[PDB]
Design a binder for this molecule. Structure first.
Ligand code: CLA
Ligand code: CLA
Ligand code: CLA
Ligand code: CLA
Ligand code: CLA
Ligand code: CLA
Ligand code: CLA
Ligand code: CLA
Ligand code: CLA
Ligand SMILES: CC1=C(/C=C/C(C)=C/C=C/C(C)=C/C=C/C=C(C)/C=C/C=C(C)/C=C/C2=C(C)CCCC2(C)C)C(C)(C)CCC1
Ligand code: SF4
Lengths: 733, 142, 69, 161, 64, 34, 31, 41, 80
């Protein structure tokens, strides 16, 4: 009768606690709500996007405010290499005096947290210097979030609600997002870099009160409009330049040096400015491709129809894909998440090797935390992309309009795809595990010379093709007579070769047999997770065991014990099973990154080169060895600032085991137990006076799987984050 | 077929009590009542757990769920060869005859029975969910 | 259902008017206000001895590795 | 040298590992009488280690930083004996096994009770099938070219789309 | 007659059948006017439920 | 810190009072029959 | 330099207004 | 002997015999040709 | 409660009716099979969703199909 799940009549009429759980867990599945129209669906999605933007901007404004109010941003800027950043103050009434004095770091007057997000380095690089600058930024972002909230409320009003056709205008949206959202934003950012960040890094102080007075270049906009742009690169910064100080500074605003700043071990600000200018030009050009209102452009549908091979190997090609993609929000979500996961992996892989922020390479814990953060985010995003592809096939795929096109051909030979993924996973797993066990047994028997150590010569050849002279292949920028070397020796190679031939940084680290084995483990993880996800996506509509799986939806428990048993037969269950494998794969990736960088930072890379070829080395020289300071955070003899990370380590272990509980015992035990407890409560005096309204029931099968998965993932993340931070900050090395 | 009425003078089986029985649901929502005729005093197993002696004649047993009524009735039919019928009883005194709606057990085909839920096509000839997008109906409902 | 339990109960009826026959209006609002204000006052006016977080650090900073502070 | 790896003959780490292992074995040996069986076992260990290291040196293995032979699997002619030659031997053996298994399955699908033939293997039939694996690649190519190797997609069970 | 001859080898065209693109032997065909799936097919291999026989209409069976 | 008392004020609220009000309101809302 | 109490209260008022707008948007999403 | 030969031809007995023979062959090969990482040719 | 559907592939073996623990299915006259009967589900409001009727159907794919949903009081099998 219009209870809490007002969007679902069936849940509202459920007299159990299942109503509450499923109303909480099915709120954002707008397409499943009762009396849902596509117009209302699109408008609700638009307003929810506005709300998310407001939330993101509030989060960043709160970061700014807390750093401005409780941080040491000015003290850190005066002395970055010997000041620990402060995240925020701590007011825990449960602390004792030893905890109060253990957490007083960073020159604070009380317990504080030490930031590991890199916001200090990032804000110092972009020109922010004082706490008033950060406060102004926080207030501005509060205003921006308020504006987005106002917009989200406004476009839901009757006279400003957009129509469905407006939401399906793909060409105009692409044009505007490529030109303005991507291109003009990058143009504005390079304008900031030219006007504020670079002068700040060269000792000048440019703010709003002198933006029109401060001259970014002595020859302002003359050579720009005369075509002689080289004037903006005549006087680059010297190698004796000190960041933020006029000593050794130059006058060029758009250089092309490449490599790293010698004192900050980061990319040059002028190189990044020229980067953003170039990509802004490219994006603004690219955003003029499609046809909106002026008779010029492209018709994306006609592009898709035109692209069909005449030989018929692809069938009808891409005919009907425009309508399939524009009519299905799940296809768009899957594509967006795929691209976003790839780009997040790219960000993680490029910021550790090419640090863009000053004094960020020296902050080892910050680098490790950032890498692990973005890699886990990327993995989750990829799982989401595949899950939404499965949801597209179940709910949005029409075989009538998609007849013999590429999607239908994928569905046709899906058995071949899944079988070849199975073969690749099996081969990789068998041989990598066998080599690891061989090495383990050889070290166990005292004969390390009998190991199967395969040199990663392909990646080393690529490194040599990038300018690495350590392996002596002498080709493609490793040789003086190569045409690529001659072409590049004038522009970036003086910096790039110097940076890549420096082994003190993380630019193309030296690799060996352990690197070979772990990259093959990574390939195994990627291939197996993709196998599970693609199998779920392509068997989502049906299979031999359940030919009518599409009528049962995306997430259903099972089809009963008939036909041999049908546990985890849904595509949602494929996602459930692939979350474990992605967690494992990102765990391997981060374990490798972290160990490689611990042995690099400490200066003893021989430990990794000798111990990473067998798994006992991984257990002992990485996990057991680096957890000594972690587990001593609090002990019978006292406690220190790592006590919080020890407590979180144990906390993550506990949540992991509780996830095990929800994943092993399935439903019936708890339903019978709850029956018994209901009897007990109804028969107990002084307590049968208190009565429940929702009949207590055991958790459902899908809900049990999801709760166990959430516990497992939370324990995974917290345990590894605690270990990572404690072992990288207990020894700053 | 005229459904029988639920007599209130039918003795219950000899049972010593159990923790598996009627609860607050029986007094706020509904319960069930199964009746059967027995030729002799014999021991049967209660569906809620335990043993009881059925009367040599009419019997009357209160249950909390329909599934327990079917379990006891199936055991009675396949073991003691006893005809049974049960009713759904509401707190307001409403009694609904349930199991032999037409006097004949559902396993035997009987004339006058209407086909409910019967689809005139193969299971694999269902419409795709995509064609029924934004329509508040299911593929199997067509 | 014996009705003769207490004899002197005029005081208890007299003193309890804010809670009885109020439900969501008076009792709930009073409880929210008198919990928020009470805990705020206690946390703002607690002395150093009773509460360690407000006592503040007393020893010198322990200082971290690699000379970072 | 093929990724900055020195040959193990003039690798100082390889010789250091030789010396360390021999010294450890001799230290274990000092606590036993010369005529005792444990002494004979340890001396056999020492001889085994010496011959192992001499064999590793004589085949031009590439030792990295410290003494550890590293395998080159890029197809270099100087290292064909590490992966290409044993790899081909493996391919011959694995293809043998699979081919003869496939042949046995073919030869028992025409039987009246194939499942009994799978749980109870026809040893004479199986053995005369196994004998045919000597020339397995030729048979595989012949079946591929004739079209008897791959089943047509029209006769293979597939799930609904 | 209705469908294939008795004992003939027939291939299944039902997409939802466990024996799609598989060969079976016809056991019996019912000539009663009104039966929708009169052809009885025996198969050499069982399905997941353990059943090795099914009923099909003549239009979803082809001669080898 | 400019206002040291301000954490001692806010943390108790968002820690105890805000959850109390939020959970009370949500419990009243999800138990409505309408 | 360190922020003042006037700045703190300005931030608090701005957050209160943003909360009002958030509640408004939530009520608009509800129905 | 027909039944005994049939039992000995069962999957587990034949697997035991074949894998034991293979293990003995490999063990003896390693006895006479041990600790080889490179195929000499 | 749950939705139970019967298809024309049914052969009137009655095995789904005998396996039902809550008496949801029953056999009705029909003329599409040799048995001259077909299953039907007139009282699905009593269905719990066990799919025991599905396990008892001998057709290649099931002539009786249970789709679940709603999860009312009778569906959850609650005695309290
Ligand atoms: C120039 C015109 C223009 C502009 C500026 C925008 C801008 C926007 N639109 Mg679009 N829109 C337009 C025209 C335009 N629109 C037209 C003409 C239509 C149809 C007629 C639409 C239809 C439309 C819909 C239907 C939706 C939007 C949405 C949005 C907003 C989402 C932005 C977002 O989340 O990602 C912005 C992300 C970036 C800018 C980052 C891109 C950078 C890439 C990844 C490269 C990597 C750089 C890296 C991040 C930099 C590192 C930074 C680090 C230091 C922190 C955004 C503000 C969505 C929304 O949220 O609405 C509220 C939405 O749902 N628009
Ligand atoms: C769960 C999501 C999540 C979270 C919590 C984080 C958290 C973090 N990221 Mg990551 N990131 C994520 C997802 C996430 N990331 C994904 C999916 C991507 C891929 C696109 C990235 C890519 C990424 C990069 C490339 C970088 C980070 C950085 C950071 C850190 C700084 C905080 C931040 O982003 O500033 C929050 C900032 C904002 C919300 C403001 C962004 C808005 C920009 C400035 C818009 C510019 C357009 C402008 C308005 C146009 C002008 C208009 C007109 C004048 C022309 C922090 C550790 C940075 C870092 O590590 O620095 C130390 C960094 O460099 N992230
Ligand atoms: C959207 C980004 C953006 C914006 C808003 C501005 C805005 C401005 N720039 Mg900047 N600038 C930018 C990008 C941007 N620029 C980039 C990408 C470059 C590199 C080519 C420059 C290089 C540049 C120079 C070299 C000069 C300006 C100048 C100016 C001012 C021009 C005033 C006038 O017309 O006289 C104005 C404040 C001029 C100025 O400040 O005059 C006082 C000036 O001398 N700009
Ligand atoms: C742009 C990003 C994006 C968007 C817009 C959506 C939108 C949607 N998704 Mg997708 N999804 C995404 C990313 C996204 N998702 C990613 C990254 C993943 C991989 C993890 C998934 C995986 C996924 C699955 C598997 C499913 C959806 C579903 C849905 C729909 C309903 C979601 C719902 O009920 O919300 C309600 C929100 C929840 C139930 C989440 C509750 C909180 C979770 C469990 C995390 C809590 C962790 C922990 C307890 C909190 C921290 C504790 C602390 C102590 C550490 C909706 C259309 C569902 C759907 O379409 O149904 C057919 C569906 O089945 N999504
Ligand atoms: C260490 C734990 C572990 C291991 C070894 C495996 C191994 C495997 N999983 Mg599993 N899995 C695990 C944990 C594990 N999983 C967990 C925690 C989850 C989350 C629920 C999953 C979820 C999962 C899914 C969803 C899928 C897999 C798949 C796979 C296969 C991937 C291919 C591969 O590696 O082939 C190499 C094979 C192995 C590493 C297996 C071990 C081989 C042993 C060592 C050789 C035999 C030794 C010896 C002779 C036996 C002695 C016993 C006795 C005779 C005396 C493989 C069989 C995928 C699959 O089957 O695709 C083909 C797949 O779809 N797994
Ligand atoms: C999302 C951003 C964010 C986050 C996570 C935090 C986190 C914290 N703040 Mg800060 N704060 C923020 C923004 C944020 N703040 C902003 C924008 C302001 C300006 C008004 C402040 C002003 C502020 C003060 C004055 C104090 C804190 C304090 C605290 C701590 C205790 C919690 C508390 O009392 O909150 C109080 C928070 C507010 C009054 C700000 C309003 C809430 C903001 C706007 C976020 C709300 C929306 C956000 C998206 C959450 C959505 C909920 C959920 C869906 C995730 C905690 C570390 C206390 C502290 O330092 O203790 C040591 C303290 O005394 N905050
Ligand atoms: C990005 C985050 C995000 C966004 C944009 C939304 C958006 C939405 N959710 Mg989802 N949700 C989220 C996170 C999010 N939710 C999380 C983390 C959970 C917990 C798992 C839920 C659980 C959930 C449920 C169970 C339901 C929704 C509903 C809704 C809709 C809002 C209607 C409603 O009841 O508002 C709730 C909020 C308000 C009505 C007003 C309060 C707004 C915020 C939360 C607080 C504002 C500040 C507050 C007053 C304190 C400040 C004090 C002072 C300054 C004033 C809308 C589509 C409902 C719906 O109709 O779905 C279709 C619904 O039933 N959501
Ligand atoms: C089935 C696999 C198999 C194979 C191919 C071999 C092969 C061999 N074994 Mg046997 N052996 C095996 C299993 C196997 N062994 C098992 C399981 C055991 C343990 C019971 C032994 C115990 C064993 C001993 C004790 C000896 C051999 C010896 C030999 C070698 C010399 C044969 C000889 O002199 O005639 C052997 C037959 C007769 C004398 C009759 C030969 C290479 C001999 C050797 O290495 O000589 C130096 C030797 O002395 N083997
Ligand atoms: C897939 C992973 C893998 C791989 C590639 C290897 C590979 C190897 N291991 Mg390792 N090992 C593994 C897993 C693996 N092992 C695991 C999981 C364990 C734990 C149980 C071990 C434990 C282990 C130990 C303890 C030892 C090895 C040894 C060896 C080596 C030789 C073994 C041997 O019998 O060669 C001898 C050669 C043969 C048996 C040749 C095959 C003979 C057949 C019958 C073919 C006959 C010829 C054919 C018909 C004609 C071909 C053409 C002709 C021209 C040649 C070899 C480098 C040994 C070694 O020497 O270390 C370096 C050793 O001592 N391994
Ligand atoms: C299921 C599905 C889905 C999803 C899916 C996915 C998620 C996918 C993914 C995918 C992916 C994730 C992909 C990736 C890719 C990649 C690539 C393709 C790459 C390429 C590269 C290149 C080409 C390179 C080049 C180069 C280099 C090498 C370096 C230097 C420079 C240059 C540029 C030259 C959807 C929803 C759609 C729908 C349905 C189906
Ligand atoms: S549905 Fe299946 S089990 Fe039930 S009568 Fe029809 S064929 Fe028999």
């Amino acid at each position: 009768a219009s209870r809490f799940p007002k969007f679902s009549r069936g849940l509202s009429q459920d007299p159990t606690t299942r109503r509450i759980w499923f109303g909480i867990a099915t709120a954002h599945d707008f397409e499943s709500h009762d009396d849902m129209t596509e117009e209302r669906l699109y408008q609700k999605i638009f307003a929810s996007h506005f709300g998310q933007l407001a939330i993101i901007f509030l989060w960043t404004s709160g970061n700014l405010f807390h750093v401005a109010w409780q941080g040491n941003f000015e003290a850190w800027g005066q002395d970055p290499l010997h000041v620990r950043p402060i995240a925020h103050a701590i007011w825990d009434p449960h602390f004792g005096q030893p905890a109060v004095e253990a957490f007083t770091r960073g020159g604070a007057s009380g317990p504080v947290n030490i930031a590991y997000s890199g916001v200090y380095q990032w804000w110092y690089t972009i020109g922010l210097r004082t706490n008033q600058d950060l406060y102004g930024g926080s207030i501005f972002l509060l205003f921006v979030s308020a504006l987005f909230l106002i917009a989200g409320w406004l476009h839901l009003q009757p006279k400003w609600k957009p129509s469905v056709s407006w939401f399906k205008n793909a060409e105009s949206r692409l044009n505007h997002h490529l030109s303005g959202l991507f291109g003009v934003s990058s143009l504005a950012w390079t304008g900031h870099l030219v006007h504020v960040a670079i002068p700040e890094s060269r000792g000048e102080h440019v703010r709003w009160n002198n933006l029109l007075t401060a001259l970014p270049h002595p020859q302002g906009l003359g050579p720009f409009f005369a075509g002689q742009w080289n004037v903006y690169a005549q006087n680059p910064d010297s190698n004796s330049h000190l960041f933020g100080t006029s000593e050794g500074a130059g006058t060029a605003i758009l250089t092309f040096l490449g490599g790293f700043h010698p004192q900050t071990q980061s990319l040059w600000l002028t190189d990044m400015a020229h980067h953003h200018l170039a990509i802004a030009v490219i994006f603004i050009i690219a955003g003029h491709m499609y046809r909106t209102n002026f008779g010029i452009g492209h018709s994306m549908k006609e592009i898709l129809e035109a692209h069909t091979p005449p030989g018929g190997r692809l069938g009808r090609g891409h005919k009907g894909l425009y309508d399939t993609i524009n009519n299905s929000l799940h296809f768009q979500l899957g594509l967006a998440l795929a691209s976003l996961g790839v780009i997040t992996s790219l960000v993680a892989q490029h910021m550790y090797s090419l640090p863009p922020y000053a004094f960020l390479a020296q902050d080892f814990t910050t680098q490790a935390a950032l890498y692990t953060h973005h890699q886990y985010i990327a993995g989750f995003i990829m799982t989401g992309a595949f899950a939404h592809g499965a949801i597209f096939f179940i709910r949005d795929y029409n075989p009538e309009q998609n007849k013999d096109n590429v999607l239908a051909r994928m569905l046709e030979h899906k058995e071949a795809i899944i079988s070849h993924l199975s073969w690749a996973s099996l081969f990789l797993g068998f041989h990598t595990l066998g080599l690891y066990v061989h090495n383990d047994v050889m070290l166990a028997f005292g004969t390390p010379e009998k190991q199967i150590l395969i040199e990663p010569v392909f990646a080393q050849w690529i490194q040599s093709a990038h300018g690495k002279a350590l392996y002596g292949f002498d080709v493609l920028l490793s040789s003086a007579d190569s045409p690529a070397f001659n072409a590049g020796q004038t522009l970036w190679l003086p910096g790039w070769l110097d940076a890549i031939n420096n082994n003190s940084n993380s630019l193309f680290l030296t690799i060996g047999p352990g690197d070979f084995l772990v990259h093959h483990a990574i390939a195994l993880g990627l291939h197996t997770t993709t196998l599970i996800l693609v199998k779920g996506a392509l068997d989502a509509r049906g299979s031999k065991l359940m030919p009518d799986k599409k009528e049962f939806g995306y997430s259903f428990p099972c089809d009963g014990p008939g036909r041999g048993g049908t546990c985890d037969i849904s595509a949602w269950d494929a996602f459930y099973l692939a979350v474990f494998w992605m967690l494992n794969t990102i765990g391997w990736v981060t374990f490798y990154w972290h160990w490689k960088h611990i042995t690099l930072w400490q200066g003893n890379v021989a430990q990794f080169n000798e111990s990473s070829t067998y798994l006992m080395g991984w257990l002992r020289d990485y996990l057991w060895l680096n957890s000594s300071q972690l587990i001593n955070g609090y002990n019978p003899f006292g406690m220190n600032s790592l006590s919080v990370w020890a407590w979180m380590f144990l906390f993550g272990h506990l949540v992991w085991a509780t996830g095990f509980m929800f994943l092993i015992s399935w439903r019936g035990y708890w339903q019978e137990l709850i029956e018994t407890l209901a009897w007990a409560h109804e028969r107990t005096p002084l307590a049968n006076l208190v009565r429940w309204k929702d009949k207590p029931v055991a958790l459902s099968i899908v809900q049990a799987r999801l709760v166990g998965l959430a516990h497992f993932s939370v324990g995974y993340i917290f345990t590894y984050a605690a270990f990572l931070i404690a072992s990288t900050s207990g020894k700053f090395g | 077929f005229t459904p029988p009425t639920l007599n209130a003078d039918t003795p219950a089986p000899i049972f010593g009590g159990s923790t598996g029985g009627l609860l607050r649901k029986a007094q706020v929502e509904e319960f069930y009542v199964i009746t059967w005729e027995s030729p002799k005093e014999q021991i049967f197993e209660m569906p809620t757990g335990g043993a009881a002696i059925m009367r040599s004649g009419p019997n009357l047993l209160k249950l909390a769920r329909k599934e327990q009524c079917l379990a006891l009735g199936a055991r009675l039919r396949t073991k003691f060869k006893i005809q049974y019928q049960f009713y759904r009883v509401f707190p307001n005194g409403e009694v609904q005859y349930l199991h032999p709606k037409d006097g004949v057990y559902p396993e035997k085909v009987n004339a006058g029975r209407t086909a409910v839920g019967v689809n005139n096509r193969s299971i694999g000839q269902n419409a795709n969910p995509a064609e029924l997008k934004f329509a508040h109906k299911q593929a199997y409902d067509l | 259902d014996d009705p003769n339990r207490y004899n002197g109960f005029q005081n208890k009826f007299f003193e309890t008017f804010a809670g009885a026959f109020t439900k969501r209006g008076l009792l709930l609002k009073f409880l929210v206000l008198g919990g928020a204000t009470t805990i705020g006052y206690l946390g703002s006016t607690s002395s150093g001895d009773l509460l360690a977080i407000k006592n503040g650090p007393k020893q010198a900073p322990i200082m971290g590795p690699r000379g970072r502070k | 040298d093929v990724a900055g790896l020195t040959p193990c003959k003039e690798s100082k780490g390889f010789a250091k590992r030789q010396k360390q292992e021999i010294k450890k074995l001799e230290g274990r040996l000092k606590l036993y009488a010369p005529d005792s069986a444990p002494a004979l076992a340890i001396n056999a260990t020492i001889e085994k280690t010496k011959r192992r290291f001499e064999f590793y040196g004589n085949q031009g293995l590439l030792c990295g930083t410290d003494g550890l032979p590293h395998l080159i699997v890029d197809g270099d002619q100087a290292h064909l004996g590490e992966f290409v030659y044993p790899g081909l031997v493996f391919l011959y053996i694995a293809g043998w096994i699979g081919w003869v298994g496939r042949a046995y399955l073919i030869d028992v699908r025409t039987s009246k009770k194939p499942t009994e033939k799978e749980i109870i293997i026809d040893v004479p039939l199986a053995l005369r099938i196994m004998s045919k694996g000597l020339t397995w690649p030729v048979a595989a190519i012949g079946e591929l070219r004739s079209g008897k190797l791959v089943e047509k997609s029209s006769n293979i069970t597939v799930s609904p789309r | 007659v209705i469908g294939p001859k008795r004992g003939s080898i027939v291939k299944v065209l039902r997409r939802e059948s466990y024996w799609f693109n598989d060969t079976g032997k016809v056991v019996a065909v019912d000539q009663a006017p009104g039966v929708r799936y009169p052809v009885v097919v025996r198969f050499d291999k069982v399905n997941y439920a353990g059943v090795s026989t099914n009923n099909y209409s003549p239009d979803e069976l082809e001669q080898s | 810190m400019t206002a040291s008392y301000l954490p001692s004020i806010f943390v108790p609220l968002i820690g105890l009072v805000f959850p109390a009000i939020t959970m009370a309101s949500l419990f009243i809302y999800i138990e409505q029959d309408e | 330099t360190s922020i003042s109490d006037s700045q703190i209260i300005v931030a608090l008022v701005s957050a209160f207004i943003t909360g009002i707008l958030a509640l408004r948007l939530g009520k608009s999403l509800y129905q | 002997m027909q039944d005994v030969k049939t039992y000995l031809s069962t999957a587990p007995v034949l697997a035991t015999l074949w894998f034991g023979f293979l293990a003995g062959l490999l063990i003896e090969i390693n006895r006479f040709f041990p600790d080889a990482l490179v195929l000499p040719l | 409660a749950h939705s139970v559907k019967i298809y024309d592939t049914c052969i009137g073996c009655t095995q789904c009716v005998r396996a039902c623990p809550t008496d949801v299915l029953e056999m009705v006259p029909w003329d599409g099979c040799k048995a001259s009967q077909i299953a039907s589900a007139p009282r699905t409001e009593d269905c719990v969703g066990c799919k025991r009727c599905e396990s008892a159907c001998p057709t290649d794919f099931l002539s009786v199909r249970v789709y679940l949903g709603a999860e009312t009081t009778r569906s959850m099998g609650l005695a309290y």
